């Protein structure tokens, strides 16, 4: 996260760190969506050009974390993975369309003041909140600039109009994507960066006062660059698949 700040305690209880097991290394962010499902970006697990094909056996998640370099006894929970599910039409070769993945935890995780799921949007939440100038919040560890924090970082960013999103980049963008960030003329700065993918773009519904995850940190060109925007996987546009793996798989 570029130009963000230290998260306060319990600010992002849905926050999940995704680790490679051996050698151990923090790969990506993720979010907890029930006691047993963790959401993340597909490119965090599967990226053929780099021969990356991480599976349930290769991966670990940590939940309830605040500090990347301090073991949070009686707070943080380490979880093993039952299975991993990557969206079938995840477009790794081109634009990372449908950059979404689901991971089932071996055993259900116990909720605390520090561990709590985020909500998934319905059509009414998407229709109302996915609008130009509306702010969402993005969280994660990893690069403070193009340099990796020990406290979880948080930044608020406005959704950008699709025409500006489209004209800003030569990448082909789909409806399964939206973009967020300040324009040059706005004074403010801020963007996700290397290490932040998989993390949640959340919004606080003014209707029921719950936080919803509307996006997943996906991609960008540089970090925090004038005239460029971060691009996020569009969660509601992929609910059909999300609901389907959750419904069909184990419970």
């Amino acid at each position: 996260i570029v130009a963000g700040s230290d998260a306060e305690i319990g600010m992002s209880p849905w926050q999940v760190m995704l680790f490679r097991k051996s050698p151990q290394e923090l790969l990506c962010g993720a979010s907890l969506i029930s006691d047993r499902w963790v959401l993340t970006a597909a490119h965090c697990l599967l990226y053929p050009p780099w021969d990356k094909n991480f599976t349930e056996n290769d991966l670990l998640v940590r939940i309830g974390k605040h500090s990347r370099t301090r073991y949070e006894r009686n707070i943080e929970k380490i979880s093993m993975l039952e299975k991993i599910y990557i969206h079938p039409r995840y477009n790794w070769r081109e634009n990372l369309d449908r950059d979404i993945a689901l991971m089932k935890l071996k055993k259900p995780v116990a909720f605390s003041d520090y561990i709590h799921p985020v909500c998934l949007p319905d059509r009414e939440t998407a229709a109302s909140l996915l609008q130009a100038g509306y702010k969402g919040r993005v969280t994660g560890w990893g690069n403070l600039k193009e340099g990796q924090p020990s406290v979880l970082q948080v930044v608020n960013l406005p959704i950008v109009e699709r025409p500006v999103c489209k004209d800003s980049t030569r990448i082909r963008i789909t409806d399964n994507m939206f973009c967020a960030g300040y324009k040059p003329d706005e004074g403010k700065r801020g963007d996700a960066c290397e290490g932040d993918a998989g993390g949640p773009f959340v919004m606080k519904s003014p209707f029921n006062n719950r936080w919803y995850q509307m996006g997943i940190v996906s991609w960008g060109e540089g970090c925090d660059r004038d005239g460029k925007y971060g691009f996020y996987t569009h969660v509601f546009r992929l609910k059909k698949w999300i609901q389907k793996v959750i419904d069909q798989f184990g419970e």
């Binding site: 600010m11 799921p117 909500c119 100038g133 702010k135 919040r137 919004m203 936080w211």
Partner: protein
Amino acid sequence: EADCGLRPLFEKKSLEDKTERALLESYIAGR
């Protein structure tokens, strides 16, 4: 899940985090 999107340390204690009002404020600016 039943109880999603509600933070035990914030919404539940009726407390606002340092920066969440900026979101609210931005949601009413779109008319």
